[PDB]
Amino acid sequence: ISNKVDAMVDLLDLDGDSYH
Amino acid sequence: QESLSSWIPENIKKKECVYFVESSKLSDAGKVVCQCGYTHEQHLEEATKPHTFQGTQWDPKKHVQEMPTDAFGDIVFTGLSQKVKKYVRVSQDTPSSVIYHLMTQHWGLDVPNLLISVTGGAKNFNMKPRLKSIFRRGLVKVAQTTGAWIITGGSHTGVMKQVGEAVRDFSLSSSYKEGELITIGVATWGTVHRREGLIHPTGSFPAEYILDEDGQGNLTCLDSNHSHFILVDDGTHGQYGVEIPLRTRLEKFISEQTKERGGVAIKIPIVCVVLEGGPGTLHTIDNATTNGTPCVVVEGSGRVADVIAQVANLPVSDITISLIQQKLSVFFQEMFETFTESRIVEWTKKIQDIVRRRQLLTVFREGKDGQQDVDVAILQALLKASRSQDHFGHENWDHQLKLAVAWNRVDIARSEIFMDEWQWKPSDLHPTMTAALISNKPEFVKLFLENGVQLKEFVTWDTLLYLYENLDPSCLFHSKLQKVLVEDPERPACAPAAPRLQMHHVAQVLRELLGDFTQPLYPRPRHGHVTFTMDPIRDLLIWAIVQNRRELAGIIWAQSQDCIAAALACSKILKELSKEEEDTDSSEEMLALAEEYEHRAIGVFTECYRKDEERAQKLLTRVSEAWGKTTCLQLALEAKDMKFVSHGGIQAFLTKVWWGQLSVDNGLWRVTLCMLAFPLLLTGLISFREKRLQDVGTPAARARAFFTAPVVVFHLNILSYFAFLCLFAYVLMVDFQPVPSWCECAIYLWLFSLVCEEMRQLFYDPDECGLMKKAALYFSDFWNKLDVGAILLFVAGLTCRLIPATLYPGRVILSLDFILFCLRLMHIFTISKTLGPKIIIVKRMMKDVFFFLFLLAVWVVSFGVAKQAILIHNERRVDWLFRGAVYHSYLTIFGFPEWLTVLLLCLYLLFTNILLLNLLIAMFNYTFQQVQEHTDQIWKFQRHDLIEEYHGRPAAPPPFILLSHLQLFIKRVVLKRHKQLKNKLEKNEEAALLSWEIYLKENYLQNRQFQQKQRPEQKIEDISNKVDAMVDLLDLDGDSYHVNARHLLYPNCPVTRFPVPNEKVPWETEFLIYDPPFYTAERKDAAAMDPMGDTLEPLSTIQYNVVDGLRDRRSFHGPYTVQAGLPLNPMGRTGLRGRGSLSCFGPNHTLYPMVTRWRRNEDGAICRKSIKKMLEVLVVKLPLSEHWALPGGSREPGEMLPRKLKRILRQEHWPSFENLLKCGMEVYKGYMDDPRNTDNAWIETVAVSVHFQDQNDVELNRLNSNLHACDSGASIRWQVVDRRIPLYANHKTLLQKAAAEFGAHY
Amino acid sequence: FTMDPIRDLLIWAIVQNRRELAGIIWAQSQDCIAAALACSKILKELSKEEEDTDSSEEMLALAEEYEHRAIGVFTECYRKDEERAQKLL
Ligand SMILES: Nc1ncnc2c1ncn2[C@@H]1O[C@H](COP(=O)(O)OP(=O)(O)OC[C@H]2O[C@@H](O)[C@H](O)[C@@H]2O)[C@@H](O)[C@H]1O
Ligand SMILES: Nc1ncnc2c1ncn2[C@@H]1O[C@H](COP(=O)(O)OP(=O)(O)OC[C@H]2O[C@@H](O)[C@H](O)[C@@H]2O)[C@@H](O)[C@H]1O
Ligand SMILES: [Ca+2]
């Protein structure tokens, strides 16, 4: 359950000048 | 005390209406009232005289006068309490310095740390029970810790009654605790019921006031719980509200003008708070918030609270006067119809001017899921207000944090106070560390540690003394320390009776708690910057462990120096303390803590054993310098540290001592066989370790090293004792004579040798200890008791054998002696593996079998006397019948006549053969059930002292121990343990050993906390915190006017103006109720200013928007409209008709010059902000302005208008030169917002800015020399520029407008 | 009105083995240490004559809980001020 809810909180937390 | 009673009629005044101006509306049975009607037919306490003018509508400025006050003093309520209460009647206008000097000096109230001013509804107040709960715990809990000053209105009604009750019961329930939550009440002198008894012309040092809740018409009576009383008088009688400006004015002067401890100033923080109110409440909040005190309102509480809390986050322009009465009439639904439009516009104006200043207000929100405290609200209402009030203040940074300690808010203090912008040094956290420690707050000391406070630098000597001065008085150790310190006899001469607390006192109680063997820890002085002890963290550990503070001690153990001594000492102290506790809940926790510390000691030592064993053995035999010159092992012995001594490696150390110089594995039978033959040891018969003795065979050294081992001396003493018994038995059996034999005298010689060995067993003193205590620890031993009983019986028997007339007595006495010696040999079986555990149970069951056997004796005595009385003739023989019946009773106990014989034998069979056997069965079941299996650990703990006693003993069997006694007795005639059980190591060695130890501790701690992370309760807690963060994350998915003009309280002129909302400001919008008073100043009819303050006459003829000669009566912005021959404000409406204190109508033109320069560092380069730079302005402070402001003058003269600001300030002749140099740059011109604006006479300005770019010698040199500044002013000085710097807010607008011209910061 | 109302309601709610109702109305009681012991005495004197194998166990455990409540109040009042707390017995 803890691994499930940590995957859940990870998924919910998921939401130049060119010179010489 | 009489200085007060003289001082009050000198100092304070009180108001007096002097003339009868008879009121038109005659009062309710007070028809003779002259518009105040206090105590006469008139409003007079003197002759109601004509006074040369009977002025109709007698002016309160002109009629009412001041008089010296006599109504002061003390008070008591008749029977309702027993304590006394101070009270003072005070004038309407009084300097707050006077009242502060009174309350400090002549009342004896020290300076506070917090000022809560609570306000609410007085006569008509109703509350839900949930609101009632916060007053009982939230207000009292936050008042009682910080040492607050609850200031409120003094009344017996409503909310003030709730505060009065909720502070009273705390004082009763405190159970004679020190200190009382001081409470000061302020009410008006007019609306007091029975105040005629209070006026005593002399000093009323006693007084009596009886409250009566019957005669309350217009008036109201006092409350009986407030501890000081202040009665503002006004001269009026029934007025409500003459106490608000005095309370608000006094609160500020107390908060921000009295504490200046190391610096400029430091302000005592201050909070106003409301519950539910009406028209008195809004005026109080509005008058308070202009003075800088924050205000927290509570949601879900009452009428005014809800209508403020609904309009909290709204924009300021969004308030409609319709919306006000709409939200008003629903919450005021009892008296909603009692509202008129003028009351609606007044309340709309007040709510507008309050919710403008969003910094100084907070809502409690009534979160109602935890319903946490007032404290979480009050802290944020401090912090938001403190930043806005000042940015350079440092008192709030250190004064605030301390307060945040006392309510246990670590998330707030971490997030808000410890973000940035403090620039603290770490040692500056030292005093606020200390109060975090005494108040037992582990979280804040953990946060200070993670922020970088060093314990080793922190604990000074005097700091430790102060720590012990403030022990928790509930604990047992405080009572024991008090019982010592009161019984301290050597403190004769001092100013007081209770002398002091010195460190040798707590050292003396610690020595008696710890045991006799240690030395005193702290020395007594035989008589700086920072005196340090030998080891600081030891002392703090002792302090935190005597008071049963668990989680605090668990932190500061982790920084300890030498840990294995420390955990065992803290186990010993707790076990010695938990016996004398006598409270059924303290003893269990105080025991389990000691068990946890035993676990910590085992956990460190089992690491250090596994890393390197032979070094880890050196850790036990070390003598610790810290804990009073003892070792670790003896400390573990005295504490009955059962689980510690049964560890494997320490038992291996004990065995390695036991087998001595030779190896440990060669068994016992081979030991007996090499004991049998002398050169068998010289042969390859036995083992050895330390192979220089095993390989290189030096047989003299090998024989000496063989005899040095204590197993050898043990077996030799056993053999000699055995032969002693056998030859003693032979001389006792047949070889006994009245003349002494020779086999007898040899045996008496061997027993003399035994008694001299027991003598040196008693007299040996390795370290100095109590000699009587040495005898006590001797005689506490079981086998010592048996040995001394045997020797005293022996010398008594030898005395009896020296009597030839008692030979058969004396001989059999020496028999009984023999029996004692037999039990001595049972001592041998303690050393076995398998028998000692059984011997323990015998030593157990002796204790109750004794008290059983006494009962058996009384039973058999009763039986014997009964049988002797029933079955004999009447006889009194000496030893015939009594001894015959005693032998018959011994035959019975060791193993018509028909009915009586059957009755006697059946009584014997039912009694002595049955029930006491069942007592024995039950008692020994209860005994043997209890022993369980602990017995092996009891034996392993019992193993040590035998090895000790044989290690100390000399090597000879006791016929030859005299050879040992002679050399030791002659060495102690002329002028120290062995170095295998206690040795003082090299200092250089001990440093390396302790560093190795303190390395290994941190390796223990990680495994400890990591496996503590695997308990399931920890996992459930982590899952709950995860899902609460998850539900929080998922739950996550105005019109600019002249607002300083509309603001009330026209300065230096006690008048008012009309309430004007944000709607009816401009001249375009019609306001049908707009009726401002035609207000003029007293100096509006005066000198060279225009006399048109009373321009209803045709005297108003000067030029409008044109220069009427020297009066350039023309705006820089544009042409003002004229109505009824007077100009109107082009900006809108202000609420006051007339000229006011201004010179003339329209604009009154003035020039505001500002000087600017750069702020350099110590080098001379520009100091830098985050992006911009630092700027300096030169400002003035007048002696009666209490404010810094710009040196700007009225432009009534042409060029000397800066000299009209600064003739006295700048110079006289060089001032005209700098005025020639004053050709600078202009930033802003036109109409200016100001509180001195009516609808007619406003202020227009021109603003010039002159600058110093170079900060060396140039234009600035002329400003330096051309300065005669000290003319008629208090102070002028240069000043840093920032957005928080003190000034008029009107001038702050000028600086924030002109700071863009040079790019300074903000 | 009677001499003390909440006493009577406590008696009524405790003779009928209503647990969670009695636990509420104990909290408003007047003199609590007498009340918890009286309600323990009534339950122990009643649970003997019950003769139902399921009612007697709950009717006994309730009395044990009320003994716990009396101890819990008295150990507070002892710790605050001992010599006044002796006057309570
Ligand atoms: N100082 C007073 N003492 C007792 N009663 C009062 C007082 N002032 C007003 N009252 C009565 O209270 C009634 C209205 O009470 P509310 O509107 O609930 O309270 P409010 O008038 O807002 O008074 C706020 C009160 O709090 C105090 O800090 C302050 O002295 C102010 O008077 C009125 O009928 C009035 O007679
Ligand atoms: N824009 C403003 N912002 C704040 N306060 C103001 C402003 N304009 C005037 N005041 C206040 O109004 C009060 C009366 O105004 P003036 O006396 O006309 O102002 P000024 O002449 O600059 O000050 C005279 C000073 O001499 C002292 O006797 C007196 O204490 C006052 O500080 C003063 O105390 C001043 O502090
Ligand atoms: Ca002995």
UniProtKB/Swiss-Prot annotation, chain B:
InterPro entries xrefs: Ion_trans_dom, NUDIX_hydrolase-like_dom_sf, NUDIX_hydrolase_dom, TRPM, TRPM_SLOG
Activity regulation annotation text: Activated by intracellular ADP-ribose, beta-NAD (NAD(+)) and similar compounds, and by oxidative stress caused by reactive oxygen or nitrogen species. Ca(2+) and PI(4,5)P2 are required for channel opening by ADP-ribose. Activation by ADP-ribose and beta-NAD is strongly increased by moderate heat (35 to 40 degrees Celsius). Likewise, reactive oxygen species lower the threshold for activation by moderate heat (37 degrees Celsius). Activated by moderate heat (35 to 40 degrees Celsius).
Family: Belongs to the transient receptor (TC 1.A.4) family. LTrpC subfamily. TRPM2 sub-subfamily.
GN (gene name): TRPM2
Motif (Nudix box): 1193-1214
Protein name: Transient receptor potential cation channel subfamily M member 2
Organism: Homo sapiens
Sequence positions that bind Ca(2+): 758, 761, 784, 949
Extracellular topology ranges: 732-742, 804-811, 866-885
Keyword field: Calcium, Calcium channel, Calcium transport, Cell membrane, Cell projection, Cytoplasmic vesicle, Disulfide bond, Ion channel, Ion transport, Lysosome, Membrane, Metal-binding, Phosphoprotein, Sodium, Sodium channel, Sodium transport, Transmembrane, Transmembrane helix, Transport
